[PDB]
Design a protein around this motif. Structure first.
Motif, PDB file in Angstrom:
ATOM      1  N   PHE A   1       9.868  -4.250  -0.185  1.00 39.69           N
ATOM      2  CA  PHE A   1      11.255  -4.111  -0.619  1.00 39.69           C
ATOM      3  C   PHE A   1      12.089  -5.371  -0.449  1.00 39.69           C
ATOM      4  CE2 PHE A   1      10.929  -0.093  -2.143  1.00 39.69           C
ATOM      5  CZ  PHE A   1      10.821   0.959  -1.241  1.00 39.69           C
ATOM      6  N   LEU A   2      12.014  -5.975   0.732  1.00 38.69           N
ATOM      7  CA  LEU A   2      12.781  -7.180   1.029  1.00 38.69           C
ATOM      8  C   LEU A   2      12.471  -8.307   0.060  1.00 38.69           C
ATOM      9  CD1 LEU A   2      12.170  -6.993   4.859  1.00 38.69           C
ATOM     10  CD2 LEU A   2      14.463  -6.931   3.819  1.00 38.69           C
ATOM     11  N   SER A   3      11.246  -8.316  -0.443  1.00 36.54           N
ATOM     12  CA  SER A   3      10.802  -9.354  -1.359  1.00 36.54           C
ATOM     13  C   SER A   3      11.012  -9.053  -2.842  1.00 36.54           C
ATOM     14  CB  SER A   3       9.318  -9.642  -1.110  1.00 36.54           C
ATOM     15  OG  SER A   3       8.732 -10.296  -2.220  1.00 36.54           O
ATOM     16  N   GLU A   4      11.141  -7.778  -3.196  1.00 34.00           N
ATOM     17  CA  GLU A   4      11.288  -7.417  -4.602  1.00 34.00           C
ATOM     18  C   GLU A   4      12.672  -7.032  -5.108  1.00 34.00           C
ATOM     19  OE1 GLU A   4       8.217  -4.373  -5.063  1.00 34.00           O
ATOM     20  OE2 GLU A   4       6.848  -6.026  -5.548  1.00 34.00           O
TER      21      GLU A   4
ATOM     22  N   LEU B   1       8.372  -0.106 -13.127  1.00 36.61           N
ATOM     23  CA  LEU B   1       8.158   1.057 -12.284  1.00 36.61           C
ATOM     24  C   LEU B   1       6.864   0.956 -11.490  1.00 36.61           C
ATOM     25  CD1 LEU B   1       8.657   4.769 -13.139  1.00 36.61           C
ATOM     26  CD2 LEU B   1       6.368   3.955 -12.528  1.00 36.61           C
ATOM     27  N   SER B   2       6.940   1.289 -10.206  1.00 39.65           N
ATOM     28  CA  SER B   2       5.763   1.272  -9.350  1.00 39.65           C
ATOM     29  C   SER B   2       5.488   2.689  -8.889  1.00 39.65           C
ATOM     30  CB  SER B   2       5.969   0.381  -8.121  1.00 39.65           C
ATOM     31  OG  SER B   2       6.003  -0.988  -8.474  1.00 39.65           O
ATOM     32  N   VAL B   3       4.217   3.066  -8.893  1.00 40.83           N
ATOM     33  CA  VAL B   3       3.825   4.390  -8.442  1.00 40.83           C
ATOM     34  C   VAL B   3       3.147   4.206  -7.095  1.00 40.83           C
ATOM     35  CG1 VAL B   3       2.429   6.428  -8.906  1.00 40.83           C
ATOM     36  CG2 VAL B   3       3.479   5.179 -10.803  1.00 40.83           C
ATOM     37  N   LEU B   4       3.736   4.777  -6.051  1.00 39.76           N
ATOM     38  CA  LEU B   4       3.171   4.678  -4.713  1.00 39.76           C
ATOM     39  C   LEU B   4       2.676   6.053  -4.295  1.00 39.76           C
ATOM     40  CD1 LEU B   4       3.627   1.758  -4.011  1.00 39.76           C
ATOM     41  CD2 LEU B   4       5.669   2.686  -5.094  1.00 39.76           C
TER      42      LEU B   4
ATOM     43  N   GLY C   1      16.583  -1.672  -6.660  1.00 37.42           N
ATOM     44  CA  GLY C   1      15.447  -0.788  -6.512  1.00 37.42           C
ATOM     45  C   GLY C   1      15.976   0.634  -6.479  1.00 37.42           C
ATOM     46  N   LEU C   2      15.294   1.543  -7.167  1.00 33.04           N
ATOM     47  CA  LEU C   2      15.689   2.945  -7.190  1.00 33.04           C
ATOM     48  C   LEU C   2      14.484   3.736  -6.713  1.00 33.04           C
ATOM     49  CD1 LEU C   2      17.668   5.175  -7.876  1.00 33.04           C
ATOM     50  CD2 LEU C   2      16.808   5.151 -10.229  1.00 33.04           C
ATOM     51  N   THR C   3      14.635   4.443  -5.597  1.00 35.32           N
ATOM     52  CA  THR C   3      13.522   5.203  -5.049  1.00 35.32           C
ATOM     53  C   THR C   3      13.675   6.710  -5.177  1.00 35.32           C
ATOM     54  OG1 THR C   3      14.430   5.267  -2.781  1.00 35.32           O
ATOM     55  CG2 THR C   3      13.083   3.364  -3.387  1.00 35.32           C
ATOM     56  N   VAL C   4      12.561   7.377  -5.450  1.00 35.86           N
ATOM     57  CA  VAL C   4      12.528   8.830  -5.573  1.00 35.86           C
ATOM     58  C   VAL C   4      11.190   9.333  -5.071  1.00 35.86           C
ATOM     59  CG1 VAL C   4      14.040   8.952  -7.573  1.00 35.86           C
ATOM     60  CG2 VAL C   4      11.574   8.718  -7.905  1.00 35.86           C
ATOM     61  N   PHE C   5      11.210  10.499  -4.445  1.00 36.12           N
ATOM     62  CA  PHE C   5       9.988  11.108  -3.956  1.00 36.12           C
ATOM     63  C   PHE C   5       9.754  12.341  -4.811  1.00 36.12           C
ATOM     64  CE2 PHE C   5       9.154   8.897   0.131  1.00 36.12           C
ATOM     65  CZ  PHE C   5      10.231   8.013   0.069  1.00 36.12           C
ATOM     66  N   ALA C   6       8.585  12.406  -5.437  1.00 34.03           N
ATOM     67  CA  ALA C   6       8.249  13.531  -6.298  1.00 34.03           C
ATOM     68  C   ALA C   6       6.898  14.109  -5.892  1.00 34.03           C
ATOM     69  CB  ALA C   6       8.220  13.073  -7.755  1.00 34.03           C
ATOM     70  N   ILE C   7       6.939  15.154  -5.074  1.00 29.18           N
ATOM     71  CA  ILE C   7       5.726  15.795  -4.590  1.00 29.18           C
ATOM     72  C   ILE C   7       5.578  17.210  -5.140  1.00 29.18           C
ATOM     73  CG2 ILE C   7       4.687  16.824  -2.527  1.00 29.18           C
ATOM     74  CD1 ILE C   7       6.411  13.371  -2.794  1.00 29.18           C
TER      75      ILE C   7
ATOM     76  N   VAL D   1       8.384   5.244  -7.441  1.00 30.13           N
ATOM     77  CA  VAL D   1       8.119   6.673  -7.429  1.00 30.13           C
ATOM     78  C   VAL D   1       7.036   7.031  -6.418  1.00 30.13           C
ATOM     79  CG1 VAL D   1       7.305   8.654  -8.776  1.00 30.13           C
ATOM     80  CG2 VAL D   1       8.797   6.944  -9.842  1.00 30.13           C
ATOM     81  N   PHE D   2       7.438   7.667  -5.323  1.00 32.88           N
ATOM     82  CA  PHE D   2       6.483   8.087  -4.308  1.00 32.88           C
ATOM     83  C   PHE D   2       6.043   9.487  -4.696  1.00 32.88           C
ATOM     84  CE2 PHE D   2       7.033   4.714  -1.196  1.00 32.88           C
ATOM     85  CZ  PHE D   2       8.243   4.155  -1.603  1.00 32.88           C
ATOM     86  N   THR D   3       4.743   9.668  -4.889  1.00 31.06           N
ATOM     87  CA  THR D   3       4.229  10.966  -5.290  1.00 31.06           C
ATOM     88  C   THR D   3       2.810  11.219  -4.793  1.00 31.06           C
ATOM     89  OG1 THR D   3       3.773  12.394  -7.213  1.00 31.06           O
ATOM     90  CG2 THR D   3       3.371  10.022  -7.462  1.00 31.06           C
ATOM     91  N   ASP D   4       2.435  12.493  -4.757  1.00 29.90           N
ATOM     92  CA  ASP D   4       1.104  12.893  -4.326  1.00 29.90           C
ATOM     93  C   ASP D   4       0.249  13.140  -5.570  1.00 29.90           C
ATOM     94  OD1 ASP D   4       2.590  15.113  -5.160  1.00 29.90           O
ATOM     95  OD2 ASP D   4       1.436  16.493  -3.910  1.00 29.90           O
ATOM     96  N   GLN D   5       0.844  12.905  -6.738  1.00 32.48           N
ATOM     97  CA  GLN D   5       0.168  13.098  -8.022  1.00 32.48           C
ATOM     98  C   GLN D   5       0.396  11.894  -8.942  1.00 32.48           C
ATOM     99  OE1 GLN D   5       2.510  16.727  -7.727  1.00 32.48           O
ATOM    100  NE2 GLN D   5       1.016  17.691  -9.104  1.00 32.48           N
ATOM    101  N   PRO D   6      -0.201  10.739  -8.609  1.00 33.52           N
ATOM    102  CA  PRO D   6      -0.053   9.520  -9.412  1.00 33.52           C
ATOM    103  C   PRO D   6      -0.358   9.699 -10.899  1.00 33.52           C
ATOM    104  CG  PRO D   6      -1.003   8.991  -7.311  1.00 33.52           C
ATOM    105  CD  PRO D   6      -1.071  10.496  -7.447  1.00 33.52           C
ATOM    106  N   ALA D   7      -1.391  10.478 -11.203  1.00 30.21           N
ATOM    107  CA  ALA D   7      -1.792  10.712 -12.586  1.00 30.21           C
ATOM    108  C   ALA D   7      -0.808  11.589 -13.353  1.00 30.21           C
ATOM    109  CB  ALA D   7      -3.186  11.338 -12.622  1.00 30.21           C
TER     110      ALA D   7
END
Ligand code: HG
Ligand code: HG
Ligand code: HG
Ligand code: HG
Length: 263
Positions: free
Chosen positions: A118-121, A108-111, A55-61, A89-95
């Motif tokens: 995480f433990l399951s994926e 890729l998942s957009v949160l 899993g690769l996580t990034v926050f893009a706000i 990808v954690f973001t405040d702008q999903p679109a």
């Protein structure tokens, strides 16, 4: 747990160091990952046989969503190629998330801004900053229960120079005579369990500091360094894994510049 298949590769000379210019193992016997220290073919075998998912996580706000396209595109070319990858990808702008073409076995998942997920994926979590780009190989050689990355501006400095939090009033406090290395807050990871333990620990410590009216000199990074000092990483990544060529150039000691800041 299956056995590796027959493989043909050059023999390693016991009486010949792999690198004579850098330290390749820590005092607690954790390898320090430099180009030349690993045979990627052997490692790829070991991890594929385990059907490893990273899993690769990034926050893009806010304005940082603009860095996603390059980040994701370069990751597709250099990050864990051949293995299963799940970008979060954690973001405040999903679109505003760019539609990047992904190789097979990669998703890729957009949160919008669920740890149990995480433990399951995934088997491992890699947490990095989005305003970066991959320029070379970043693969399974980094996977381990817990890893930190040597900050590019301090790998050759004395510990007294490390910008650790120096105020005893802070939970991230580290005295002048303590410390192994200065790790980056922007590139760490390991097993889901170890990563969640680190983040949970740093979250609690930062709350304590807040209540006490104090903020660590380098925030999250200051606490990550305190955590890794007290819980030794099982692998340490060389500055090859997070470099800034604009500010530091390209030293002979760096055979590859794999992940870098964007000008
Ligand atoms: Hg993370
Ligand atoms: Hg911490
Ligand atoms: Hg934190
Ligand atoms: Hg942290």
């Amino acid at each position: 747990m299956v056995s590796l298949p027959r493989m043909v590769y050059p023999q390693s000379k016991v009486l010949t160091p792999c690198r004579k210019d850098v330290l390749v193992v820590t005092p607690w016997l954790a390898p320090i990952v430099w180009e030349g220290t690993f045979n990627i073919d052997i490692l790829n075998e070991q991890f594929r046989l385990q059907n490893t998912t990273i899993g690769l996580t990034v926050f893009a706000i806010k304005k940082y969503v603009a860095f996603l396209k390059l980040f994701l595109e370069t990751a597709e070319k250099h990050f864990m190629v051949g293995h299963r990858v799940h970008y979060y990808v954690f973001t405040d702008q999903p679109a505003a998330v760019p539609r990047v073409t992904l190789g097979t076995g990669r998703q890729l998942s957009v949160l919008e801004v669920c740890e149990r997920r995480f433990l399951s994926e995934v088997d491992y979590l890699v947490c990095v900053d989005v305003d970066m780009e991959f320029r070379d190989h970043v693969g399974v050689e980094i996977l381990t229960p817990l890893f930190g990355t040597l900050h590019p501006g301090f790998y050759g400095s004395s510990r007294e120079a490390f910008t650790y939090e120096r105020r005893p009033q802070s939970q991230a406090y580290i005295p002048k005579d303590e410390g192994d290395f200065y790790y980056l807050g922007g590139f760490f990871g390991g097993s889901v369990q170890e990563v969640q333990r680190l983040t949970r620990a740093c979250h609690q410590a930062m709350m304590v500091d807040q209540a006490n009216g104090i903020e660590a000199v380098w925030h999250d990074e200051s606490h990550l360094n305190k955590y890794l000092l007290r819980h030794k990483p099982t692998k340490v990544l060389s500055p090859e894994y997070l470099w800034d060529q604009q500010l530091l150039g390209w030293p002979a000691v760096l055979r590859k510049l794999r992940f870098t800041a964007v000008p």
